[PDB]
Amino acid sequence: MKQDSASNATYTVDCEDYVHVVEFNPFDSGEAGSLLAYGGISYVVIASCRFQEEDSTVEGIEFKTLKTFHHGERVVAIAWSPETRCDALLPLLRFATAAGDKKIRIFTSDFQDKNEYKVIEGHSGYINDLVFCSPEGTDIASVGDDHTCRIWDLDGKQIAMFILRSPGMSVAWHPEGAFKLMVAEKTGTIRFYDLTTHQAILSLESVQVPLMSADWCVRNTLRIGAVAGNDWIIWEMPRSSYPQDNKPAHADRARMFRWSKCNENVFATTGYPGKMKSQIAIHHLAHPQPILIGTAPVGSGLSWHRRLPLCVVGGYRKLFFWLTEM
């Protein structure tokens, strides 16, 4: 937990379903404005959202649902490929999910009433994380509970498999990089994979365990953020095989670490979900204290706006938006 500059959601969105997963569009949109998607237990809803931050005609927030799709077993993680289109006569959609079935499923859509599906095979132990590993995404890297990092194609074939020491909790794409991937282990091992040559380049070691959530800096490559134990840690390349900076993130078991998609010094963290009406802690660098605290009755999902310093956290049938600094 963290409590500093606690406030209500700058924007609050009322939905017809509890929020299981929810997150923005990272980059590469066919048109202006942020698409966002939330999947619950049997439905996934994509909706375009406009803020008074961006648009003056849009007052507060104008959220308009593009689609609600009937899916099966509850979606537990969603993979965006930064190649989707919103312009012209055909909006491209190629998005993946991992559900309460341990399996991965790929969905392609065009708004023209064509949507077919590719279910991607699993492995030993549940899919812990999955991200498209191209700057537009065509291939997905997944980490699971077999200490294997398995790269798959759109067809469902093993692009690659890397043998890890412990089951990987998180896999991360480098939008600033090119086939630069991170794989995070519970023991505290961070591995950088050059998927262009399948040669592992650099490693990081965390002194706080277990390690489950991390991220690159969005506006910098030397800065690597993560949450371990109960504190948030930043490593500075190439001078660390140990925490460069480590400051408390959440007294309870902090779960998610995210970096601002327009800031190289502002990041967001979530508390341990639910329970104490979990708080989003928006931190600025060189501040153990969070520069912002927001309250969501359950901690479910954490996203950063494509170019706004806007952080969204889901909760019980609701979405909560907080704006932060550069």
Partner 1 sequence: FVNPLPDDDLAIGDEQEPQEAYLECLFAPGRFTIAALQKAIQILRKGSGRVLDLSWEELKKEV
Partner 2 sequence: HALLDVYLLENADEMSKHAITIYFLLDIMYSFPDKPDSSIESFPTAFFVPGSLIKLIQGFWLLDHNDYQNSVDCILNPASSRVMSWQHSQIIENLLCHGDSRQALRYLQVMKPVATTSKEVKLHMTVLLANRSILEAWNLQRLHSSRLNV
By CB under 8 A, name the binding residues for partner 2.
17, 42-43, 70-73, 101
Which span sits near partner 1 by CB under 8 A: 69-77, 108-116, 133-141, 203-211? 203-211
Given a contact cutoff of 8 angstroms between Cβ atoms, the answer to whether 51 and 11 are in contact is yes
> Using the rule CB under 8 A, which residue among 115, 158, 196, 241 binds partner 1?
241
As a whole number of angstroms, the distance between CA 17 and CA 105 comes to 22
Q: How far is the CB of 151 from partner 2 (least distance, A)?
A: 25
287 binding partner 1? (CB under 8 A) = no
User: 231 with 248: CB under 8 angstroms?
Assistant: yes
Report the 10 Å Cβ neighbour count for 58.
15
Interaction partner, residue 275 (partner 1, partner 2, none; CB < 5-8 Å by kind): none
Q: 312, 310, 281, 250: which is closest to 21 by C-alpha?
A: 312
Size of the site for partner 1 (CB under 8 A): 9
Distance of closest approach, residue 203 Cβ to partner 1, in angstroms: 5
Residues 97, 80: contact at Cβ < 8 Å?
no
Q: Which is nearer to partner 1, 209 or 326 (CB)?
A: 209
Does 250 engage in binding with partner 1 (CB under 8 A)? no
Q: Residue 242, interface with partner 1 (CB under 8 A)?
A: yes
Of 32 and 209, the one with the shorter C-beta distance to partner 1 is: 209
Question: Which residue among 189, 221, 230, 240 contacts partner 1 (CB under 8 A)?
Answer: 189
Q: Which two tokens stand for residue 32?
A: 């202006």
Please name every residue paired with 284 in a beta bridge, in sequence order, or none if there are none.
Answer: 266
Query: CB count, 10 Å around CB of 26?
Result: 22
Instruction: Candidates 196, 207, 275, 307: give the one binding partner 1 (CB under 8 A).
Output: 207
Angle of CA points 189, 128, 21, to nearest 5° = 125
Residue 73 interacts, among partner 2, partner 1, none and using kind-specific CB cut-offs from 5 to 8 Å, with partner 2
Instruction: Return the DSSP state at 74.
Output: P
End-to-end, the C-alpha distance of the chain in Å comes to 23
Q: Report the interface residues with partner 1, using CB under 8 A.
A: 165, 189, 191, 200, 203, 207, 209, 241-242
